[PDB]
Design an enzyme around this catalytic site. Structure first.
Site: not given
Lengths: 4, 121, 121
Positions: B38, B49-50, B69, B95, B112
């Site tokens: 991902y 962010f990731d 999540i 979030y 994502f």
């Protein structure tokens, strides 16, 4: 609470 | 590409970029360990962010168990083996009002790209 | 019991409750998939915010790969098979100044009880  | 709304509030919207494999044997079930790659970014700023691709380590979790999540549990449950999608998550499925950590503000829409590589019981 | 300061800043402090197995083959290596049970609570209130024991689903991650909060990567890397510990994480090794979601305020110290069940390559 993943991912962040 | 057609967008699939996975919830009725338009808070989880998947666009399939690469069709996965057909047949029930290629669709994951609640509890299964799924293996994915991902990349997540903020919609507003476009900043990543990731990413599991950064370290080149496929990420594994147990589907529908709240290890990730809510939007992921919803999105990955709709995928089949080898499918690549982009999914847009309202904060409700991410979030929420408070956000999480340094990179994710409260009330952030998340995008994502998720590839479902494999899964097992 | 001995408290092992895993960082020089006192931010990750591990207390061993149950000694695990010795032998090089019984300590995980960077990249290995580790399987753990854990219970996390806020130090201040003792309120549990997340627990793999809740769902009774052991949690798996790839050690040292940034898949989890930093304090977990540091703590689990110090553990051996069957070890049970309690680790105190300063917010720097947890969710930082911002915290995360509803249950973890900014600048929270976290306490996790972590059992290393097994690991593999």
């Amino acid at each position: 609470a993943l991912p962040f | 590409l057609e967008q699939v709304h996975l919830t009725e509030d338009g808070g989880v919207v998947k666009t399939i970029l690469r069709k996965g494999e057909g047949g029930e044997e290629n669709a994951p079930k609640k509890g299964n360990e799924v293996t994915v790659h991902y990349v997540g970014k903020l919609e507003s700023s476009g900043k990543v962010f990731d990413s599991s691709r950064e370290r080149n380590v496929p990420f594994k979790f147990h589907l529908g168990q709240g290890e990730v999540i809510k939007g992921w549990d919803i999105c990955v449950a709709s995928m089949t083996k080898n499918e690549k999608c982009s999914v847009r998550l309202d904060s409700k499925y991410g979030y929420g009002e408070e956000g999480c950590g340094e990179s994710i503000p409260g009330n952030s829409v998340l995008i994502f790209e998720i590839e479902l590589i494999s899964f097992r019981e």
